[PDB]
């Protein structure tokens, strides 16, 4: 066990906390600082070269944040809970002109996480898989990252089989939220690039740094 699910859960538990789009952007900036602390507690992340640690977090931050507020929001009806303590109701999101992408988050992520009772170990592992993205451009050693990804999904499958032996399809169900998370990430990014371009919305320095070119 070079990738124990106990350490991945510890990482989740260690970091656990009108324009709605202004509140969302403040929350995203705040959570980017927490995301660096989270990543440092994932086994073997901090032993990668610093340039590769940067490429992985620049590639994955939007998906990692989306995964976290989505899991956080499973107790909420028709909304999301931000790390800042604030709720965005689907009605506010529709009235701010981001209804369609907000409903995608509710339907494809929050609802599906709620229905299967995805647990914080499962969430941690999915986020670790996102983080260890071996397709990220410019990695010095994509094979090392691929090896870390393989160890995360080996540990996750063993955890699922042990913890939920009645649900043989559960491992595959977890992995098959990742295409939805990818598509929703890209659409959320497109919204952010627009907010920046129109200048309609304050963007704080870490969020702004993540939107700057590579």
């Amino acid at each position: 066990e070079d990738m124990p699910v106990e350490r991945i859960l510890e990482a989740e538990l260690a970091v656990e906390p009108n324009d709605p789009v202004t509140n969302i952007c403040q929350a995203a900036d705040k959570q980017l600082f927490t995301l660096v602390e989270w990543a440092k507690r994932i086994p073997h992340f901090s032993e990668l070269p610093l340039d590769d640690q940067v490429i992985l977090l620049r590639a994955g931050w939007n998906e990692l944040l989306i995964a976290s507020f989505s899991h956080r929001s499973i107790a909420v009806k028709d909304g999301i809970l931000l790390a800042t303590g604030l709720h965005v109701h689907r009605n506010s999101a529709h009235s701010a002109g981001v209804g369609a992408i907000f409903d995608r988050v509710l339907t494809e992520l929050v609802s599906k996480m709620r229905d299967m009772q995805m647990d914080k170990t499962e969430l941690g592992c999915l986020r670790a898989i996102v983080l260890f993205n071996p397709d990220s451009k410019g990695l010095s050693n994509p094979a090392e990252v691929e090896a870390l990804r393989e160890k995360v999904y080996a540990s996750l499958e063993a955890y699922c089989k042990h913890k939920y032996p009645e649900q043989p399809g559960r491992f595959a169900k977890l992995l098959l939220r990742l295409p939805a998370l990818r598509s929703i990430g890209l659409k959320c990014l497109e919204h952010l690039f627009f907010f920046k371009l129109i200048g309609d919305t304050p963007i704080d320095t870490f969020l702004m740094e993540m939107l700057e070119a590579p």
């Binding site: 600082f33 660096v36 440092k40 610093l50 640690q53 940067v54 977090l57 620049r58 320095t205 870490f206 740094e209 993540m210 700057e212």
Partner: peptide
């Protein structure tokens, strides 16, 4: 040019 991310990743604690 990613000042803030480099600084946070380097700092141990």
């Amino acid at each position: 040019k990613h000042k803030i991310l480099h600084r946070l990743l380097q700092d141990s604690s």
